[model samples]
Target: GPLGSNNELMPHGVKTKACVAGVDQAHCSVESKCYYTSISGSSVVAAITSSNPNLKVASFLNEAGNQIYVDLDPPCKFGMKVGDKVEVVYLYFIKNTRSIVRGMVLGAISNVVVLQ
Candidate 1:
């Protein structure tokens, strides 16, 4: 089997906020109009942090089940309270061999839904 350039299984979590690249999640409460970017040259998955006017990240759990969750401050004006659903559209490589590549979702955690 060949691993894709940015191949990784989606994580299990619930969606929290809605956002897009170059646009804040505050003004754009509609999830249908939000897109995100990667970290520099890394095509790997990137975490989608919920942002607000006050610059607060929506609290969330990383793929590893870490408790240092992300948070979205100021909250979303679209009523994005706790337990919302977000989608995961990113992936990253963890252990890549000549045949098997184990990756993780960088931005796939929302309450209890698979973003991707």
Candidate 2:
């Protein structure tokens, strides 16, 4: 009964995918895949995906600046490690951001720890 922030599972913005219009910046490491929200307000939309593809990285901004992340959906396969940190609950960018913060890691955080 844990695993918070499902945000009622879709409807605040409709459609889905904030950007993929062309797909670039992600080519660098600004790593954004777009879920939605934004006056563009703050940022940190989490993600995880692995069905044999591999660990699709999400978000965890201690930002410091350059602590950026984005990739909202690809399924999931919790296998984490290497200074592990993940707390993804982005049921559509949680009503336009800040659904919760501060050391938030509720779901996927186990880099290489295990998965199936």
Candidate 3:
């Protein structure tokens, strides 16, 4: 199949192409170490206290006997009024490395909210 002469891959999609092309598959390990910290400039305690007053965070042993599971309650406040703007910022750790991720405003509770 000819991809055509004018069409080129977007810059954002180059990493995907490199992986698919087997550029380093033979030498690159499937696992890599990643280290992370929150970008909010606050501790987990501060985030919970400032954002979600009703939420609870805890870690307990699950039924598996050795698995420790972490539980977090609904982070955002419910029963939001009209015209309220809710911003959700989530930080994901990819193998311990910090990565910025965005999520919806939780069940469409906020109207006319914009995302950057």
Candidate 4:
């Protein structure tokens, strides 16, 4: 069989924070946008931070304490609050071999509605 979510799944409890979302325009081959709450970010910059954009804020947060620094676009200006328990879903990140290649590799967030 192949390797991907078609045969695997991942779920976890992650705390939230409006820190920073620095993306890699070099290696990041995904073309997805950010959607926070009812609004959306304007664009995902290389480094989306509180001070970076006219609306500085983080996009994603990792519970492993290492934290995943991702920034949203102007569509969503709201990151997460401090340690807001969220049952996040990892789309293909669980099986992405990138996890093995890059130790700091972590998936981003999207498609939200349910919160626990």
Candidate 5:
């Protein structure tokens, strides 16, 4: 079935958080050590840190001049254009090592969908 293509299988220690929003802005929360991905014409910016040894704080934003500031925690924000749709995803891998592995996505910022 095509269900496999719609769902993502991350590594054993990896976790993900995702969202969909209209052209203006969207927000979501992600744990520490997570990287975010965007699907649409918009770009993403994120900041993260940790208050506890097992915690990771992260946030996201686009280039829309709407910057966010917070105290003791990380925030994420994103911006896009009118009539546009965007999908944001956050991935966190707990492993300490990096490796070359196959990756795929349902969509990206450029309206491109990768099934491999």
Candidate 6:
């Protein structure tokens, strides 16, 4: 058989085991939205902190683990509490071999729950 490629098994998507702490927007011209969270492990924090900023996208996740993409250029308004448990989704593209991760806030639910 031909040499098997080890590239297919590479992680393309990831979910963090952390909770959200805060959200902020950049003051620069582009004005990108950023999410802040503290992970259980120090290494995970270090790894994300060292990664390139361009390869990330912050978003909110619902109780069902659904994703609601957050706009970076426009910087959406987030209505998440400090203790809200959330995860950051990371997308890795094979073409550039780069990963894009985003922190998110929970979504709205018929007046029962809401996250902007």
Instruction: State which candidate has the highest lDDT.
Output: 2
* Worst-scoring 10-residue span by lDDT in model 3: 13-22
The local distance difference test score of model 1 is 0.29
Q: Pairing residues by index, what is the TM-score of model 1?
A: 0.20
Q: Order of candidates by TM-score, top first? A: 2, 5, 4, 1, 6, 3
TM of each candidate vs. truth: 0.20, 0.22, 0.17, 0.21, 0.22, 0.19
* Candidate lDDT (C-alpha), each: 0.29, 0.32, 0.24, 0.30, 0.28, 0.28
Q: Tell me the alpha-carbon RMSD of every candidate.
A: 12.5, 12.8, 18.1, 13.5, 15.1, 13.6
| Candidate 2 displacement at residue 15 in angstroms | 9.9
Q: Write the per-residue lDDT of candidate 5 for residues 1-116, one digit (tens) a residue.
A: 33355544333222233322211223324333323333243332222222223223224333575644222222222232225554232222222322211122112222422211
What ranges in model 1 sit over 4 Å off?
1-51, 70-116
Better of 2 and 6 by TM-score: 2
Candidate 2: clashing pairs of residues: 79-110, 79-111, 79-112, 80-110, 80-111, 80-112, 81-111, 87-105, 87-106
Order of all candidates by lDDT, from best down to worst?
Answer: 2, 4, 1, 5, 6, 3
> What tens digits encode model 1's per-residue C-alpha lDDT throughout 8-84?
43333322233332133333332222212333332222234333233332222244654232332132222222445
Q: Give the poorly placed runs of model 4, Cα more than 4 Å off.
A: 1-7, 18-71, 77-116
Query: Which parts of model 2 are misplaced by more than 4 Å?
Result: 1-32, 48-52, 59-65, 69-116
Residue-by-residue lDDT tens digits, candidate 2, 1-116: 24355643221221122222112224422323333322233433432222233223344443254544443333433444435553332222222234432113232232334433
Model 5 lDDT-worst window of ten: 100-109
| Model 6 ranges off by over 4 Å | 1-72, 84-113
Candidate 6's residue-wise lDDT over 5-113, tens digit each? 5432222223334322112323222222232323333112111111123433333444456754332332223233334553232222212222221322221111322
TM-score of 5: 0.22
RMSD of candidate 6 to true structure, Å: 13.6
